[PDB]
Design a protein around this nucleic acid. Structure first.
Ligand SMILES: [Mg+2]
Lengths: 147, 46, 302, 50
RNA sequence: UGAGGUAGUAGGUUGUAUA
DNA sequence: TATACAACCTACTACCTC
């Protein structure tokens, strides 16, 4: 009566040569495979953007839970899980002034080029005219650049 | 996994080991099952 | 979509990893709307949000969270995706590659340098571009593992004509085999369960023929005690279009490819990731003007 | 060097029989390893037995 | 664009057969 | 160079969140 065949679920190798089927559970138990000592971040956006990013980092530095913990496993915490330091103290700010956006945004083909030019030129001049090291750049888009 | 059950020193050779050579999670679960069986005391999100 | 893709392409010009985060995602309780109700309520998935964001940040900073272990050694998986540009209406092809060798290390990159095709339809490649694609992939594999692959596993969302396969066989070395697989994701089959009120379990496959089959990549997963979809799960069609291969190894490889998704922290996804990442690469590359040699690493794109 | 003939017994009793057997066997020309006669002093108790 | 999914709405190519 | 039809292909908006 049209028999069905069953294929097993693959296994992904976490640290210590161990195997699991859910990345969340394996990460919480064993941990990542390689050692990068830290994540030095960089923030581009308004002052409120920096405040929001700092508050979110402070929140994720400590354990968080969900409603149920079988469907969605809890969060032990960044340093407990990944063993890396990603803190708000080491942030390289690059502020976008309110007047800049309020004059530069207000044909929807040139505005979306101009704003990208703004953010990208800030990122590039930070990358080429600074001594600090940033591995990942964060772009905190305000609530008016998307609508 | 490279040490057979027939090469143990003669002090624990008569006791049954807990399997930890394939998956650490299952061995740890066996440890907790035994600990609950023998009423080992614990003091408690655990 | 203009903002994200343009930013990522113009920074791809300079090879700078980046991540875009809206203010509403990070601070959702503040952006209230319609009488004190957040537009998006992360009141019960905040841990999942943290999981996803932290995993993405960790991957973009140069770390691998996990790796694949159960994949056949000595094969290459290529995923071809066609994106139409109507700025002549050319069709651009971008690929992603994945192979494992010399230490159980998974090398997941994207073969780029989009090869175009100047027809309105015709989601296919001319012989020259196909030869260039295969030569680049084989040279990358040989550079990494100091030897040529024993087999090549080419899959795409479309089919292959005889022109492409003839070119591919022309550039293929003496002892390398090619297999063509097509993964269609909308063919109307639905297997309702007779008794329970929960969907069909994931991992079930129907072998209609020696070269075609269905696969359930969604549905109820026992470990999570929930479903990876909504309504009734939709299977995905698998066909061995060209070349000789078994229909079981193909399905195992498809599941293995559906495992790894570094952009999100989930149990699995419906479609293999080699095609989704290739599609993202395609959008980013066609959003720009012109790039001579684009970076292959996935951090700059995703 | 599989020539020794191991003999096991109980500690407090069943020692006289073991001594008699070991002496007779050594007199007959075999090689016998026993806890009574052999197992020189100051040696690890169980490693040598194993 | 933190992500996943389900649907809807539009078009287009090929293959006959026509004029 | 178009009317009608099967078989495939992509591309947007809008709504849920287990
Ligand atoms: Mg992402």
């Amino acid at each position: 009566m049209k028999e069905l065949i069953y294929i097993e679920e693959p296994s992904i190798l976490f640290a210590h040569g161990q195997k699991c089927t859910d990345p969340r559970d394996g990460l919480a138990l064993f941990g990542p495979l390689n050692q990068i000592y830290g994540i030095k971040s960089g923030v581009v956006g308004t002052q409120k953007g920096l405040q929001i990013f700092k508050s979110y980092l402070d929140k994720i530095q400590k354990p968080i839970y969900n409603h149920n913990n079988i469907t969605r496993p809890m969060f032990p915490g960044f340093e407990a899980v990944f063993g890396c330091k990603w803190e708000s103290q080491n942030i390289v700010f690059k502020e976008i002034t309110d007047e800049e956006i309020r004059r530069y945004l207000f044909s929807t083909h040139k505005r979306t080029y101009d704003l990208v030019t703004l953010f990208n030129d800030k990122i590039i001049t930070a990358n080429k005219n600074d001594e600090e090291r940033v591995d990942v750049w964060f772009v905190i888009v305000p609530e008016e650049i998307y609508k | 996994e490279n040490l057979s059950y027939d090469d143990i020193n003669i002090e624990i050779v008569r006791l049954n080991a807990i399997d930890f050579k394939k998956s650490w999670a299952k061995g740890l679960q066996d440890l907790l099952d035994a600990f609950e069986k023998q009423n080992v005391p614990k003091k408690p999100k655990s | 979509a203009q903002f994200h893709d343009q930013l990522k392409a113009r920074l791809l010009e300079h090879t700078i990893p980046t991540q875009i985060l809206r203010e509403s995602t990070l601070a959702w309780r503040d952006f209230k709307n319609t009488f004190g109700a957040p537009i998006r309520d992360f009141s019960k998935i905040e841990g999942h949000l943290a999981w996803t964001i932290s995993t993405a940040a960790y991957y973009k900073a140069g770390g691998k969270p996990w790796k694949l272990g159960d994949i056949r050694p000595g094969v290459c998986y290529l995923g071809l995706v066609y994106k139409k540009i109507e700025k002549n209406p050319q069709n651009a092809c971008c690929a992603a590659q994945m192979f494992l060798d010399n230490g159980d290390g998974t090398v997941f990159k994207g073969e780029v340098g989009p090869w175009y095709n100047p027809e309105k339809g015709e989601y296919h490649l001319k012989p020259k571009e196909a030869k260039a694609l295969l030569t680049q992939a084989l040279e990358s594999y040989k550079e990494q593992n100091k030897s040529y692959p024993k087999e090549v596993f080419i899959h795409a969302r479309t089919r292959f004509n005889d022109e492409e396969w003839n070119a591919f066989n022309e550039v293929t070395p003496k002892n390398t085999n090619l297999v063509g697989v097509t993964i269609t994701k909308s063919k109307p089959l639905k297997l309702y369960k007779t008794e329970g009120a929960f969907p069909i379990m994931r991992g079930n496959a129907y072998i209609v023929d020696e070269k075609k089959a269905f696969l359930w990549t969604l549905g109820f997963v026992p470990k999570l005690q929930s479903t990876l979809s909504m309504e009734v799960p939709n299977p995905i069609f698998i066909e061995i279009n060209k070349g000789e291969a078994e229909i079981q190894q193909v399905l195992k490889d498809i599941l293995a490819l559906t495992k790894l998704n570094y952009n999100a922290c989930i149990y699995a996804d419906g479609e293999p990731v080699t095609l989704r990442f290739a599609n993202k690469i395609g959008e980013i590359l066609t959003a720009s003007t012109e790039i001579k040699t684009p970076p292959l690493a996935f951090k700059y794109y995703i | 060097m599989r020539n020794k003939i191991f003999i096991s017994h109980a500690t407090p009793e069943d020692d006289d029989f073991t001594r008699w057997l070991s002496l007779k066997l050594i007199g007959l020309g075999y090689e016998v390893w026993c806890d009574i006669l052999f197992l020189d002093k100051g040696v690890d108790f169980w490693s040598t037995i194993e």
